[PDB]
Structures are given as structure tokens and as C-alpha cells.
Amino acid sequence: RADVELERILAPYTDFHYRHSPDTAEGQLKEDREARFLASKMGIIATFRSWAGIINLCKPGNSGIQSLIGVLCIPNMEIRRGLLEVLYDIFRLPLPVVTEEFIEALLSVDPGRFQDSWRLSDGFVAAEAKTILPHRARSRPDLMDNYLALILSAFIRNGLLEGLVEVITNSDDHISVRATILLGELLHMANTILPHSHSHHLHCLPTLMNMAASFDIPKEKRLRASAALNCLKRFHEMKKRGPKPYSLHLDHIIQKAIATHQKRDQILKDTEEALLINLRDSQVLQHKENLEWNWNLIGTILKWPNVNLRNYKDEQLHRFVRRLLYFYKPSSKLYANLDLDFAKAKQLTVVGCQFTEFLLESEEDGQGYLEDLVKDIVQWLNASSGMKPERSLQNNGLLTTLSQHYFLFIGTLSCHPHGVKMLEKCSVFQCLLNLCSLKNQDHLLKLTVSSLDYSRDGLARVILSKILTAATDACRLYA
């Protein structure tokens, strides 16, 4: 039949009092409605992904899509909270968290949010980079964009945008936030997938302009529409930023890539006053212990344009580097035993890489404080890996502690031309080359793949070739 057979699935949402079974127990009457909504929701989604269902539900005359949209404007809280969940799944948008503030809900929809698949046990960097870095195809047609373009245009024609505006300014606090995010997602989806013709009546919202900053309408309704625009304004910034790296391994890969693509396209005086005043404020000398130093003032001293232990040959700076050298020494159990979920884990890891680069700047002078640091890292590898005559059961300690954040220290050293030469003297490439054939250790092989820099030639790519052809099958898959 015409409008009574297929439209039966829309009954639970269109009818506020729906009774599917004439005879049923009243004990689970409340639960029966929830079961009907879940089953009917999947039916609506299923019939909107087939061409035989899209056309029949979007007929030019009286159609079921207008009834579905029309019932959304009715001030019913139970129906509105259900129809919004349907719209998110139709366009395949991630659901935000239930809240009454826009900021908390906005942070739950960012594309760069952490996922379980990004951990070391799962795809370490390969899984994370897929959802952050963009696909390397600018002309290949995406057939899924065509499907969303047609579906989005159908709802706009029937008046989806007008219905959402009514929901935002005339619903509950935790319902308007969900509608505000949905409206923002559609506008972003529509400015890059819809053609020019459909965009003339798209970014106008005629009904929203009626409820504007005017004293004629109720004052409470006036600010809700104004606040909705303010809340929706911040949604633009999130899309402007785009996805961002979450792990320092992927972060260092992007930094070196842009750095080497800008050096081919051919600040302070730092008197003695600046150092000594700042050095005494670091608290690393008088209070010879960690968890007391001001880590904000330590990074500034290291990555400052002119101070590199060479321009300013000061005895006090010699104390500063040697005092900090003791902290990062793998043998000195002060840093390797920190928990993985440490409160200052991110800041401490950055400074460690920020410190080994500082030493390399003073090639003639800082090599004395740098030669010892790399040697003790090699001695640490011979214990966890088990190549030396020692127990190889330290895998559990490596995963749960910050001792895994040492490949970053050695990875950031291979980037510079004078850093890879230093590795030859310390003989760390030989240690990395030997550990390629390890059946028991797999997490250790993942870290060394995503650590070295292969921009130049040398032994950096030599180790990579061995891993992808002489290793475990699971290890070679990640490579």
C-alpha cells in the first residue's frame, strides 16, 4: 500500500502513546517503550540507506519524513531525546556526552580524542596516524560523500534546519546542547560537500533571525538564541585547528618533517645577568632533589637561542648541567622509576629530549656530559632486552614506567648530523641492530621502528630494513 505499510516503523516516534501488543504484561510496560524505540531506530536507519526506501519516505506529497521532522518541533522531551539519537546515526556522527555545559560536550567530539587502539599493545603509531594525518588523495572521488550529500539535501528541503532552531531555544538544558552540536556538525558537513546552488538558502536560518536580540520576544528566549550562537561560534575553532598529535612519538615525526621542508627555502642578547638570576630560581642547586625544582624555568634555560654552554663558559652553568645529568641517568634510579600516569609525565619527557639537544649544540664542550648519558642508556638496553647475561623479565617494568621514554631521547639525537656520528662512538646502532631478532620482545621492536629519523642516509635505514624482513611476523606487520 501507499502510506500505511512502510510508515509503520515510524509509529513509535510519531505516536506519543503506542501500544504494539494488545495483550501484554504491565510489569515491564516502562521497559517495553525503550525496547520499541531501540528496535524502531534501527529500522529507520536501515530504510534510509537503501534507494528503495529513501525515495518512498521522501515523496513530494505527504511523506513520512515531514511527519518525523514535524513531530520534532512539538515540545515533548521523551521524543526529542530519541529523535536526536536517530539523526546522529543517520549522518554517522559521533555522539557527545550528556551534560548541561557546551564546553564539556564540545571536548567529547574532537577528532583527536584518545582511543584504546592507539596504545602500545595495539597499533602504536600506525593506528593513531591514520585518524590524524589526512589521506594522500585530492582527486579520487569519495562515494560516501555523495550519499551524505543527497541525504543532507533531502532534510534541508523538508525543513530540518528550521526544526533544529526551535529545539535549541525551546527545550531542556541537556537537550539544547545536543541539538547545538548537531546543527554545527551539519553546517560544517554542508559547506564542503554540497554544491553552490544548495548553499544559497543553507547558511541563512530564517527562523533563527526571528528570535534574535530583540526586546519584543521574552528576554529569557532572547538570550538562549544569542547564547546558542556564542556556543556554536566556538565549534568553528575546533574544526579550524583540526586533529592534533596525542603522543610524542608522532609529534616528533611531524616536527622534523616540516623543519626539513623549510630549511631548503633560503631572541635576546643573554648577558650573564639573565642566566644567574634565572639559574637561582630553578631550585635545582640549593634543593638537590626532584619534585621541588620549577620545571617551567628549566626548559627556558635549555632551549634559549644563545645559551648553549659554549658562548658563555661559566662554572655555574657547568654545575647546572651536571646536576641535571644525574637525574636523567638510567643507572641513577631517579627518573626510570616514575609511573606512566605521573602528573608531570608530559613535561618531564619533553625536557629530557630538550636537554640532549642542548648538549649537542656544544659539540666540543657538551660531548663530555653527553658521552656518559648515551653510554648508560646502552647498558640499560642490555638488561631489559636480555642480550647480556641478565634476566630478560624486565618487560613488565618497561611498560608501566617511564623507562620506555628513552627511545625519544635517542630518536631525537639521530636527527642532527652530529648526533648520528655520536652514536657511532657510543656504539648504540650495533645494540639496536642485534635486538632485531628477538622472538620474545615485540613492544621493544615497535618503539625502535617509530624512533629513528630516516630523512638522511646511513645506518638509520639499515636497521629499518632488517626489521621489516628479519623479525617476527607480527613485528614485520607493524613495520
Binding site: 571536548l107 544569542s226 592534533k244 609529534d251 611531524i254 639573565a274 626548559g299 632551549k303 637561542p305
Partner: protein
């Protein structure tokens, strides 16, 4: 329900210079705490009276304005669509040399304190210009103006990097060595991370609060 008449009642009896001035201000501080988020429904109705206090005030030392600036800080996030007409009056109070020093002190304090709950990324060019021309005009306001400036550089991402030559001229000429500002500039000139730069200040505040 009765807030409509209370605001209207305060309209007639809030004369610019009379005995009943502070008790009106003290009522505002108690009112905003009571509503605690919905005060924006009635804030614009009293703005015109509040605007003409920073230029029409015969009190010695501009005490009335100081007692009013301390009330603006309590508003917090209530004002979002009215900051464009209330902030320029604030920035007009500390850029005038003829103004008393205590009045200019509170104008700088009320900006960094208001930064803890509001976004001033859009209001960058409106208030930065008085700051750079105050660090050289007043040798005594350098200590307190840097706190307001540094608290604003934190919200701004790498967009402030182009302002370094504009500010460094004052620093080298007058030898201004601020510890907090030294940290912020280092992370911008030389990279620190990628997810921290160009970060929305409101998201960061929510993250720290939770």
C-alpha cells in the same frame, strides 16, 4: 519574578554623585551571587548607569570606580554579549596619565582576574595597545602591567609571535625582565608541543577545573 521591578527601582535612585552610591554597588555584588549564572538576563539594564562612572566621578582617588571594578570581577562568565561595550571603558582607565595611580592599578588587576573565566582572544587589539604604551610612560606600573599582559599571552597561541618585535623594543630600552613572560615567549619562538599551541582557552580552563 520580582527581579524586573528591583532593576527598575534602582534605575531612578542611582544618581551619578550622591550619598546612595556604594549601597547600590554593594547590592549588585549580593545580587550576582544569588542568581549565579542567570544574571545576564538583567545585566544590560544597569550597564548605561555603570558606563558613566569611569569618566564622571568626582570622588577623590576614584574610589567609587575602584569599588565598582571589584564588582565586575565577580560577574565572571555572566557577560558574553556585553563585553564589547564594557571592556573599552575599563581599558580607558589605566591609559590616562592624569588618572590617579590607585585607579589605574585596579584597571590592570581586573583584566587578568577576569581572564580566568573569559576569553580575550578576540579582544586582543582593543587592550594590547594601551599596555605597550604604559610600560614606558609609567616606570612604576611596569611590575603590575606585566602580570596583565602575561596572563593574556597565555590565552593567545602562536598569533602573538608577530607581536614580539613590537614589545621587545620597550624591554630592551627599559630593561624589563619578567620571569613569567620569559617562559611564555620561549615556548612560542621555539616549539614545545603541537596540541598545546593555538589551544582554546575555555577548553583549557575546563580541563584544569576537572
Amino acid at each position: 519574578p520580582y527581579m524586573d521591578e528591583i532593576v527598575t527601582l534602582m534605575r531612578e535612585f542611582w544618581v551619578m554623585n550622591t550619598s546612595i552610591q556604594s549601597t547600590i554597588i554593594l547590592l549588585i555584588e549580593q545580587i550576582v551571587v544569588a542568581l549565579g549564572g542567570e544574571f545576564k538576563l538583567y545585566l544590560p539594564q544597569l550597564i548605561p548607569h555603570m558606563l558613566r562612572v569611569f569618566m564622571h566621578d568626582n570622588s577623590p582617588g576614584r574610589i567609587v570606580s575602584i569599588k565598582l571594578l571589584a564588582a565586575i570581577q565577580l560577574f565572571g562568565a555572566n557577560l558574553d554579549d556585553y563585553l564589547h561595550l564594557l571592556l573599552p571603558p575599563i581599558v580607558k582607565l589605566f591609559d590616562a596619565p592624569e588618572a590617579p595611580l590607585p585607579s589605574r592599578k585596579a584597571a590592570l588587576e581586573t583584566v587578568d582576574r577576569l581572564t580566568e573565566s573569559l576569553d580575550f582572544t578576540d579582544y586582543a587589539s582593543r587592550i594590547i595597545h594601551p599596555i605597550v604604551r604604559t610600560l614606558d610612560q609609567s616606570p612604576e606600573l611596569r611590575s603590575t602591567a606585566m602580570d596583565t599582559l602575561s596572563s593574556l599571552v597565555f590565552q593567545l597561541g602562536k598569533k602573538y609571535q608577530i607581536f614580539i618585535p613590537m614589545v621587545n623594543k620597550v624591554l630592551v630600552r627599559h630593561r624589563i625582565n619578567h620571569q613569567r613572560y620569559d617562559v611564555l615567549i620561549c615556548r612560542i619562538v621555539k616549539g614545545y608541543t603541537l596540541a598545546d599551541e593555538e589551544e582554546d582557552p575555555l577548553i583549557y580552563q575546563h580541563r584544569m577545573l576537572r
